[PDB]
From Swiss-Prot, chains A, B, C:
Annotated compartments: Periplasm
Name under which the protein is recorded: Soluble cytochrome b562
Entire protein: shown range: 23 to 128 of 128
Biased composition (Basic and acidic residues): 47-60
Subunit structure, as described in the record: Monomer.
Amino acid sequence: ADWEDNMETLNDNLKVIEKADNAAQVKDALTKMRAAALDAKKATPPKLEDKSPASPEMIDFRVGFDILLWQIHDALCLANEGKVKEAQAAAEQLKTTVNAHWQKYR
Amino acid sequence: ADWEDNMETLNDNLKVIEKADNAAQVKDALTKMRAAALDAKKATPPKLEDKSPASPEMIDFRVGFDILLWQIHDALCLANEGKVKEAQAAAEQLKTTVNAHWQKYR
Amino acid sequence: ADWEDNMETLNDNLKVIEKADNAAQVKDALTKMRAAALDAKKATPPKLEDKSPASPEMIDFRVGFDILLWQIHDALCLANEGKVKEAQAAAEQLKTTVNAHWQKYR
Ligand SMILES: [Bi+3]
Ligand SMILES: [Co+2]
Ligand code: NA
């Protein structure tokens, strides 16, 4: 899977979170999101393929995934305890970050 | 703004956690600390301004701020469980790491 | 410590978690694992010494340690809630990821 596939996986699991009812579905979708984000952090996005891996652009690209993962973790902690609608509301803020990172580097 | 202002934000929110009264204030201060630590991880400290962004020194700098981020996460997870005193005790460890990073990279 | 010693610390604390009785031991071993993974993010495997510190191989190395850190976080959050057995089960899968990362870069 490339970076685009990871972005698509993030978006699909965000859809699953939006269409979720219990906390187990939310937990599974958030674990999938974390795995996809960690896989995409290793990749080079299409916009930065003309840059060296040592460029500051790639460093900022990798650091943005830290914010992404912290938001994923906030949602996952809201889901681990019991609050499902709160986890969905937190993932609503997560979709903004996901799609902004997607459209910024594609 | 810059790395020094991020360190000042970290110190101010550490003092806020020290003077905190409930879990909401601790969580807010720790979220602000997480944001400031990410911003500082995106920055270049004064001592390392003569090093390339991909030098081992800068990599170790970003890893040290990752350590700070994980300690902030532990404090925030302790705060989300309603343990305000334990969250503040964990934030006492944050103060040592912040002071060490300040003295090491200023 | 270098990469091999950090991996050894990870494996020792995994064995401690496997043969743990209470939650405090699991939490202490997981904190040691977190410290070891964070420190190993600054290390270089002997077969990648000639490579660039920001080369895609080293990027995959550090982000694999990020994956380890997030799994450690899941185990530690399970242990904080008293779920010692779920934490041990998550540590079982964590050992698989540790062994995969070991076989990949050794
Ligand atoms: Bi938690
Ligand atoms: Co957590
Ligand atoms: Na880097």
